[PDB]
Amino acid sequence: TLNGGITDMLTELANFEKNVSQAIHKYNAYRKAASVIAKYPHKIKSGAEAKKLPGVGTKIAEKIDEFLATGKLRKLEKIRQDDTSSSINFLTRVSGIGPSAARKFVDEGIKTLEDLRKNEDKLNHHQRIGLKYFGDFEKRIPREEMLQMQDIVLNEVKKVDSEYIATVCGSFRRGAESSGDMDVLLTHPSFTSESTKQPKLLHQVVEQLQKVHFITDTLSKGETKFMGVCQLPSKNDEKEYPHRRIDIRLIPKDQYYCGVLYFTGSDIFNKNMRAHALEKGFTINEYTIRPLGVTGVAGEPLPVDSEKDIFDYIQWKYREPKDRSE
DNA sequence: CCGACGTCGCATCAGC
DNA sequence: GCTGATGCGA
DNA sequence: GTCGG
Ligand SMILES: Nc1ccn([C@H]2C[C@H](O)[C@@H](COP(=O)(O)NP(=O)(O)OP(=O)(O)O)O2)c(=O)n1
Ligand SMILES: [Mg+2]
Ligand SMILES: [Mg+2]
Ligand code: NA
Ligand code: NA
Structure with missing residues:
Protein backbone atom coordinates (compact mmCIF):
# COMPACT_ATOMS: atom_id res chain seq x y z
CA THR A 1 0.00 0.00 0.00
CA LEU A 2 2.79 2.42 -0.97
CA ASN A 3 0.35 4.59 -2.88
CA GLY A 4 -2.94 3.50 -1.31
CA GLY A 5 -4.35 7.02 -1.09
CA ILE A 6 -3.86 7.55 -4.81
CA THR A 7 -5.18 4.17 -5.98
CA ASP A 8 -8.22 4.50 -3.72
CA MET A 9 -9.00 7.90 -5.26
CA LEU A 10 -8.67 6.50 -8.77
CA THR A 11 -10.82 3.48 -7.97
CA GLU A 12 -13.58 5.70 -6.58
CA LEU A 13 -13.39 7.79 -9.75
CA ALA A 14 -13.58 4.61 -11.82
CA ASN A 15 -16.71 3.52 -9.96
CA PHE A 16 -18.33 6.93 -10.42
CA GLU A 17 -17.74 6.86 -14.17
CA LYS A 18 -19.07 3.31 -14.43
CA ASN A 19 -22.10 3.61 -12.16
CA VAL A 20 -23.19 7.23 -12.60
CA SER A 21 -21.77 8.62 -15.84
CA GLN A 22 -22.13 5.21 -17.49
CA ALA A 23 -18.81 5.77 -19.26
CA ILE A 24 -17.09 2.39 -19.45
CA HIS A 25 -13.96 3.66 -21.19
CA LYS A 26 -13.29 6.15 -18.38
CA TYR A 27 -13.90 3.38 -15.88
CA ASN A 28 -11.36 1.30 -17.80
CA ALA A 29 -8.97 4.25 -17.95
CA TYR A 30 -9.03 4.87 -14.20
CA ARG A 31 -8.68 1.18 -13.38
CA LYS A 32 -5.61 0.80 -15.61
CA ALA A 33 -4.01 3.83 -13.98
CA ALA A 34 -4.87 2.51 -10.53
CA SER A 35 -3.40 -0.89 -11.42
CA VAL A 36 -0.10 0.37 -12.85
CA ILE A 37 0.34 2.70 -9.86
CA ALA A 38 -0.46 -0.10 -7.41
CA LYS A 39 2.51 -2.17 -8.62
CA TYR A 40 4.88 0.83 -8.77
CA PRO A 41 7.50 0.15 -6.05
CA HIS A 42 8.09 3.78 -5.00
CA LYS A 43 6.05 6.14 -2.84
CA ILE A 44 4.94 8.60 -5.52
CA LYS A 45 6.10 12.18 -4.89
CA SER A 46 4.41 14.00 -7.77
CA GLY A 47 1.99 13.81 -10.69
CA ALA A 48 4.98 14.26 -12.99
CA GLU A 49 6.54 11.08 -11.58
CA ALA A 50 3.25 9.26 -12.05
CA LYS A 51 2.69 10.54 -15.60
CA LYS A 52 5.77 8.57 -16.64
CA LEU A 53 3.72 5.39 -16.16
CA PRO A 54 1.60 4.07 -19.06
CA GLY A 55 -2.08 4.75 -18.40
CA VAL A 56 -1.37 7.88 -16.39
CA GLY A 57 -2.00 10.95 -18.55
CA THR A 58 -2.29 14.69 -17.96
CA LYS A 59 -5.62 14.68 -16.11
CA ILE A 60 -4.79 11.92 -13.63
CA ALA A 61 -1.35 13.46 -13.09
CA GLU A 62 -3.07 16.70 -12.12
CA LYS A 63 -5.36 14.85 -9.71
CA ILE A 64 -2.39 13.16 -8.07
CA ASP A 65 -0.85 16.61 -7.58
CA GLU A 66 -4.00 17.87 -5.85
CA PHE A 67 -4.25 14.72 -3.74
CA LEU A 68 -0.62 14.82 -2.63
CA ALA A 69 -0.84 18.51 -1.70
CA THR A 70 -4.17 18.39 0.16
CA GLY A 71 -5.05 14.77 0.90
CA LYS A 72 -8.33 15.24 -0.97
CA LEU A 73 -9.81 15.66 -4.44
CA ARG A 74 -12.42 18.41 -4.84
CA LYS A 75 -14.05 16.53 -7.72
CA LEU A 76 -14.67 13.52 -5.48
CA GLU A 77 -15.73 15.67 -2.51
CA LYS A 78 -18.51 17.13 -4.65
CA ILE A 79 -19.55 13.72 -5.98
CA ARG A 80 -19.83 12.46 -2.40
CA GLN A 81 -22.21 15.33 -1.63
CA ASP A 82 -24.36 14.79 -4.71
CA ARG A 140 -14.41 -11.11 2.49
CA ILE A 141 -13.71 -14.85 2.64
CA PRO A 142 -10.66 -15.96 4.65
CA ARG A 143 -8.45 -18.40 2.72
CA GLU A 144 -8.99 -20.85 5.58
CA GLU A 145 -12.72 -20.85 4.76
CA MET A 146 -11.92 -21.05 1.04
CA LEU A 147 -10.02 -24.27 1.78
CA GLN A 148 -13.02 -25.72 3.62
CA MET A 149 -15.23 -24.77 0.68
CA GLN A 150 -12.81 -26.31 -1.81
CA ASP A 151 -12.84 -29.55 0.16
CA ILE A 152 -16.63 -29.76 0.06
CA VAL A 153 -16.91 -28.88 -3.64
CA LEU A 154 -14.20 -31.33 -4.75
CA ASN A 155 -15.53 -34.20 -2.64
CA GLU A 156 -19.17 -33.72 -3.64
CA VAL A 157 -18.17 -33.49 -7.28
CA LYS A 158 -16.23 -36.75 -6.89
CA LYS A 159 -19.29 -38.46 -5.41
CA VAL A 160 -21.31 -37.59 -8.52
CA ASP A 161 -18.72 -38.82 -11.02
CA SER A 162 -15.07 -39.55 -10.27
CA GLU A 163 -14.10 -38.37 -13.77
CA TYR A 164 -15.06 -34.78 -13.02
CA ILE A 165 -12.20 -32.43 -12.26
CA ALA A 166 -13.02 -29.31 -10.25
CA THR A 167 -10.48 -26.50 -10.07
CA VAL A 168 -10.85 -23.46 -7.82
CA CYS A 169 -9.65 -20.45 -9.76
CA GLY A 170 -10.04 -16.68 -9.39
CA SER A 171 -8.18 -14.88 -6.60
CA PHE A 172 -7.85 -18.19 -4.74
CA ARG A 173 -5.65 -19.71 -7.45
CA ARG A 174 -3.58 -16.50 -7.44
CA GLY A 175 -2.79 -17.29 -3.81
CA ALA A 176 -4.86 -14.54 -2.21
CA GLU A 177 -5.12 -14.68 1.60
CA SER A 178 -8.76 -13.67 1.18
CA SER A 179 -11.25 -13.77 -1.70
CA GLY A 180 -14.45 -11.95 -2.64
CA ASP A 181 -16.09 -15.22 -3.72
CA MET A 182 -15.40 -18.76 -4.96
CA ASP A 183 -14.75 -19.52 -8.65
CA VAL A 184 -14.89 -23.14 -9.80
CA LEU A 185 -13.76 -24.50 -13.16
CA LEU A 186 -15.29 -27.86 -14.02
CA THR A 187 -14.36 -30.41 -16.69
CA HIS A 188 -15.64 -33.85 -17.63
CA PRO A 189 -14.41 -36.17 -20.41
CA SER A 190 -17.93 -36.31 -21.91
CA PHE A 191 -17.86 -32.59 -22.76
CA THR A 192 -15.24 -31.54 -25.31
CA SER A 193 -14.96 -29.08 -28.18
CA GLU A 194 -16.04 -31.90 -30.48
CA SER A 195 -19.09 -33.30 -28.69
CA THR A 196 -21.30 -33.48 -25.61
CA LYS A 197 -21.84 -37.17 -24.88
CA GLN A 198 -23.71 -36.58 -21.61
CA PRO A 199 -26.36 -33.95 -20.90
CA LYS A 200 -26.92 -32.13 -17.58
CA LEU A 201 -23.22 -32.30 -16.66
CA LEU A 202 -23.33 -28.96 -14.83
CA HIS A 203 -26.86 -29.52 -13.54
CA GLN A 204 -25.95 -32.78 -11.79
CA VAL A 205 -23.14 -31.11 -9.85
CA VAL A 206 -25.30 -28.13 -8.92
CA GLU A 207 -28.01 -30.56 -7.80
CA GLN A 208 -25.62 -32.52 -5.56
CA LEU A 209 -24.28 -29.33 -3.95
CA GLN A 210 -27.86 -28.22 -3.32
CA LYS A 211 -28.69 -31.63 -1.85
CA VAL A 212 -26.03 -31.32 0.86
CA HIS A 213 -27.17 -27.73 1.47
CA PHE A 214 -23.93 -26.14 0.32
CA ILE A 215 -25.55 -24.26 -2.57
CA THR A 216 -28.49 -22.29 -1.16
CA ASP A 217 -29.60 -19.92 -3.92
CA THR A 218 -29.33 -19.52 -7.70
CA LEU A 219 -28.69 -16.20 -9.44
CA SER A 220 -28.44 -17.65 -12.94
CA LYS A 221 -27.90 -21.05 -14.51
CA GLY A 222 -27.29 -22.34 -18.01
CA GLU A 223 -25.61 -25.29 -19.70
CA THR A 224 -22.09 -24.03 -18.96
CA LYS A 225 -22.29 -21.29 -16.31
CA PHE A 226 -23.78 -21.27 -12.82
CA MET A 227 -23.91 -18.15 -10.65
CA GLY A 228 -25.23 -18.67 -7.15
CA VAL A 229 -24.95 -18.66 -3.39
CA CYS A 230 -23.37 -21.10 -0.97
CA GLN A 231 -22.69 -21.50 2.74
CA LEU A 232 -20.31 -23.54 4.88
CA PRO A 233 -22.01 -25.75 7.45
CA SER A 234 -21.59 -24.71 11.08
CA LYS A 235 -21.47 -26.72 14.32
CA ASN A 236 -23.84 -26.91 17.31
CA ASP A 237 -24.40 -23.58 19.11
CA GLU A 238 -22.15 -21.93 16.51
CA LYS A 239 -23.20 -18.76 14.68
CA GLU A 240 -23.78 -19.50 10.99
CA TYR A 241 -21.19 -18.65 8.35
CA PRO A 242 -22.05 -15.80 5.98
CA HIS A 243 -23.58 -16.77 2.66
CA ARG A 244 -21.03 -16.56 -0.18
CA ARG A 245 -21.15 -16.02 -3.93
CA ILE A 246 -20.06 -19.00 -6.00
CA ASP A 247 -19.54 -19.27 -9.75
CA ILE A 248 -19.13 -22.55 -11.58
CA ARG A 249 -17.96 -22.81 -15.18
CA LEU A 250 -18.06 -25.99 -17.24
CA ILE A 251 -15.35 -25.86 -19.90
CA PRO A 252 -14.58 -28.33 -22.72
CA LYS A 253 -11.95 -30.69 -21.28
CA ASP A 254 -9.63 -30.27 -24.26
CA GLN A 255 -9.86 -26.53 -23.67
CA TYR A 256 -8.84 -26.49 -20.02
CA TYR A 257 -5.73 -24.32 -20.35
CA CYS A 258 -7.51 -21.43 -22.04
CA GLY A 259 -10.34 -21.87 -19.56
CA VAL A 260 -8.12 -21.85 -16.48
CA LEU A 261 -6.11 -18.90 -17.80
CA TYR A 262 -9.36 -16.98 -18.16
CA PHE A 263 -10.87 -17.97 -14.80
CA THR A 264 -7.66 -17.31 -12.84
CA GLY A 265 -7.59 -13.66 -13.90
CA SER A 266 -7.26 -11.04 -12.67
CA ASP A 267 -9.91 -9.23 -14.73
CA ILE A 268 -7.50 -6.41 -15.51
CA PHE A 269 -4.82 -8.99 -16.31
CA ASN A 270 -7.14 -10.72 -18.79
CA LYS A 271 -8.04 -7.41 -20.45
CA ASN A 272 -4.37 -6.46 -20.72
CA MET A 273 -3.38 -9.91 -21.98
CA ARG A 274 -6.17 -10.04 -24.56
CA ALA A 275 -5.29 -6.52 -25.66
CA HIS A 276 -1.65 -7.52 -26.14
CA ALA A 277 -2.81 -10.57 -28.10
CA LEU A 278 -4.62 -8.32 -30.59
CA GLU A 279 -1.47 -6.24 -31.08
CA LYS A 280 0.43 -9.45 -31.81
CA GLY A 281 -2.24 -10.66 -34.21
CA PHE A 282 -4.11 -13.12 -32.01
CA THR A 283 -7.41 -13.25 -30.15
CA ILE A 284 -7.87 -15.06 -26.84
CA ASN A 285 -11.05 -16.24 -25.15
CA GLU A 286 -11.75 -18.88 -22.49
CA TYR A 287 -11.77 -21.53 -25.20
CA THR A 288 -9.06 -20.85 -27.75
CA ILE A 289 -6.29 -18.65 -28.99
CA ARG A 290 -6.69 -17.91 -32.70
CA PRO A 291 -4.65 -15.91 -35.20
CA LEU A 292 -6.17 -12.96 -37.03
CA GLY A 293 -5.70 -12.71 -40.78
CA VAL A 294 -5.06 -9.39 -42.52
CA THR A 295 -8.85 -9.59 -42.80
CA GLY A 296 -9.41 -9.22 -39.09
CA VAL A 297 -11.34 -12.48 -38.87
CA ALA A 298 -10.20 -15.12 -36.40
CA GLY A 299 -8.62 -18.16 -38.03
CA GLU A 300 -8.50 -21.68 -36.61
CA PRO A 301 -7.68 -22.57 -32.96
CA LEU A 302 -3.96 -23.00 -32.34
CA PRO A 303 -2.57 -25.97 -30.39
CA VAL A 304 -2.34 -25.38 -26.63
CA ASP A 305 -0.83 -27.84 -24.15
CA SER A 306 -0.19 -25.50 -21.22
CA GLU A 307 -0.97 -22.00 -19.97
CA LYS A 308 2.60 -21.10 -20.93
CA ASP A 309 1.90 -22.01 -24.58
CA ILE A 310 -0.59 -19.13 -24.64
CA PHE A 311 2.00 -16.70 -23.25
CA ASP A 312 4.49 -18.01 -25.82
CA TYR A 313 2.22 -17.21 -28.79
CA ILE A 314 1.94 -13.54 -27.84
CA GLN A 315 5.61 -13.36 -26.83
CA TRP A 316 5.04 -12.79 -23.12
CA LYS A 317 7.39 -14.34 -20.56
CA TYR A 318 5.40 -16.74 -18.39
CA ARG A 319 3.78 -15.39 -15.25
CA GLU A 320 2.65 -17.65 -12.42
CA PRO A 321 -0.93 -17.11 -11.16
CA LYS A 322 0.32 -15.28 -8.04
CA ASP A 323 1.92 -12.69 -10.33
CA ARG A 324 -1.26 -12.02 -12.34
CA SER A 325 -3.02 -9.93 -9.69
CA GLU A 326 -3.28 -6.70 -11.69
C1' DC B 1 -4.65 15.05 -32.99
C1' DC B 2 -8.47 10.25 -33.54
C1' DG B 3 -9.87 5.86 -33.49
C1' DA B 4 -9.51 2.15 -31.18
C1' DC B 5 -9.02 0.47 -26.40
C1' DG B 6 -11.30 -8.08 -24.08
C1' DT B 7 -14.47 -11.51 -24.61
C1' DC B 8 -18.28 -14.19 -23.51
C1' DG B 9 -22.79 -16.51 -20.58
C1' DC B 10 -27.34 -15.82 -18.82
C1' DA B 11 -31.65 -13.01 -17.98
C1' DT B 12 -34.84 -10.01 -19.93
C1' DC B 13 -37.25 -7.50 -23.36
C1' DA B 14 -38.97 -5.62 -27.98
C1' DG B 15 -40.44 -6.94 -32.42
C1' DC B 16 -42.36 -10.11 -35.33
C1' DG C 1 -41.59 -19.30 -30.21
C1' DC C 2 -37.59 -17.15 -32.66
C1' DT C 3 -34.08 -13.34 -33.41
C1' DG C 4 -31.40 -9.84 -31.89
C1' DA C 5 -30.35 -6.11 -28.75
C1' DT C 6 -29.60 -4.65 -23.96
C1' DG C 7 -28.24 -5.14 -19.04
C1' DC C 8 -25.30 -7.33 -15.88
C1' DG C 9 -21.69 -9.86 -14.47
C1' DA C 10 -17.39 -13.33 -14.76
C1' DG D 1 -9.05 9.16 -19.82
C1' DT D 2 -4.91 7.67 -22.40
C1' DC D 3 -2.21 7.20 -26.44
C1' DG D 4 0.14 5.00 -31.02
C1' DG D 5 0.28 5.82 -35.70
N1 LIG E 1 -14.73 -8.43 -16.03
C1 LIG E 1 -14.17 -9.60 -15.75
C2 LIG E 1 -14.32 -10.17 -14.50
C3 LIG E 1 -13.69 -11.38 -14.25
N2 LIG E 1 -12.99 -12.08 -15.26
C4 LIG E 1 -12.21 -13.34 -15.05
C5 LIG E 1 -11.00 -13.68 -14.18
C6 LIG E 1 -11.47 -13.42 -12.83
O1 LIG E 1 -10.40 -13.77 -11.92
C7 LIG E 1 -12.61 -14.49 -13.04
C8 LIG E 1 -13.44 -14.56 -11.75
O2 LIG E 1 -14.01 -13.26 -11.49
P1 LIG E 1 -14.15 -12.65 -9.99
O3 LIG E 1 -14.53 -13.68 -8.99
O4 LIG E 1 -15.18 -11.41 -10.07
N3 LIG E 1 -12.65 -11.89 -9.72
P2 LIG E 1 -11.51 -12.66 -8.73
O5 LIG E 1 -11.84 -14.07 -8.37
O6 LIG E 1 -10.09 -12.51 -9.45
O7 LIG E 1 -11.38 -11.72 -7.42
P3 LIG E 1 -12.37 -11.78 -6.15
O8 LIG E 1 -13.51 -12.84 -6.52
O9 LIG E 1 -11.56 -12.32 -4.87
O10 LIG E 1 -12.94 -10.44 -5.89
O11 LIG E 1 -13.01 -13.39 -13.83
C9 LIG E 1 -12.82 -11.49 -16.45
O12 LIG E 1 -12.15 -12.05 -17.31
N4 LIG E 1 -13.42 -10.26 -16.73
MG1 LIG F 1 -13.55 -14.63 -7.48
MG1 LIG G 1 -16.59 -14.94 -9.16
NA1 NA H 1 1.78 8.07 -18.93
NA1 NA I 1 -24.66 -4.29 -8.78
Missing part, protein backbone atom coordinates in the same frame (compact mmCIF):
# COMPACT_ATOMS: atom_id res chain seq x y z
CA ASP A 83 -27.63 13.05 -3.85
CA THR A 84 -28.25 11.42 -7.24
CA SER A 85 -24.66 10.20 -7.51
CA SER A 86 -24.58 8.87 -3.95
CA SER A 87 -27.91 7.07 -4.39
CA ILE A 88 -26.95 5.46 -7.69
CA ASN A 89 -23.53 4.50 -6.35
CA PHE A 90 -25.18 2.77 -3.40
CA LEU A 91 -27.87 0.84 -5.27
CA THR A 92 -25.32 -0.64 -7.70
CA ARG A 93 -23.70 -2.39 -4.74
CA VAL A 94 -26.63 -4.82 -4.85
CA SER A 95 -25.80 -7.73 -7.16
CA GLY A 96 -28.11 -7.57 -10.16
CA ILE A 97 -28.52 -3.81 -9.94
CA GLY A 98 -26.35 -2.10 -12.53
CA PRO A 99 -26.04 1.54 -13.64
CA SER A 100 -29.30 1.53 -15.62
CA ALA A 101 -31.50 -0.09 -12.96
CA ALA A 102 -30.03 2.04 -10.19
CA ARG A 103 -30.90 5.26 -12.01
CA LYS A 104 -34.39 3.93 -12.78
CA PHE A 105 -34.97 3.06 -9.11
CA VAL A 106 -33.81 6.52 -8.01
CA ASP A 107 -36.26 8.03 -10.51
CA GLU A 108 -39.06 6.07 -8.84
CA GLY A 109 -37.93 7.26 -5.42
CA ILE A 110 -36.31 3.97 -4.44
CA LYS A 111 -32.89 4.96 -3.15
CA THR A 112 -32.08 3.37 0.21
CA LEU A 113 -31.74 -0.14 1.63
CA GLU A 114 -35.06 0.47 3.37
CA ASP A 115 -36.75 1.39 0.08
CA LEU A 116 -35.45 -1.75 -1.60
CA ARG A 117 -36.68 -3.90 1.27
CA LYS A 118 -40.23 -2.54 1.03
CA ASN A 119 -40.23 -2.79 -2.77
CA GLU A 120 -39.06 -6.37 -3.26
CA ASP A 121 -41.76 -6.91 -5.90
CA LYS A 122 -40.00 -4.46 -8.21
CA LEU A 123 -36.79 -6.53 -8.27
CA ASN A 124 -35.96 -9.37 -10.66
CA HIS A 125 -34.79 -12.70 -9.22
CA HIS A 126 -31.05 -11.92 -9.24
CA GLN A 127 -31.65 -8.54 -7.59
CA ARG A 128 -33.89 -10.07 -4.92
CA ILE A 129 -31.16 -12.51 -3.89
CA GLY A 130 -28.54 -9.76 -3.98
CA LEU A 131 -30.67 -7.74 -1.59
CA LYS A 132 -31.24 -10.71 0.73
CA TYR A 133 -27.50 -11.22 1.16
CA PHE A 134 -26.36 -7.61 0.72
CA GLY A 135 -24.58 -7.72 4.06
CA ASP A 136 -22.94 -11.09 3.49
CA PHE A 137 -21.73 -10.33 -0.03
CA GLU A 138 -19.83 -7.30 1.26
CA LYS A 139 -17.73 -9.54 3.52
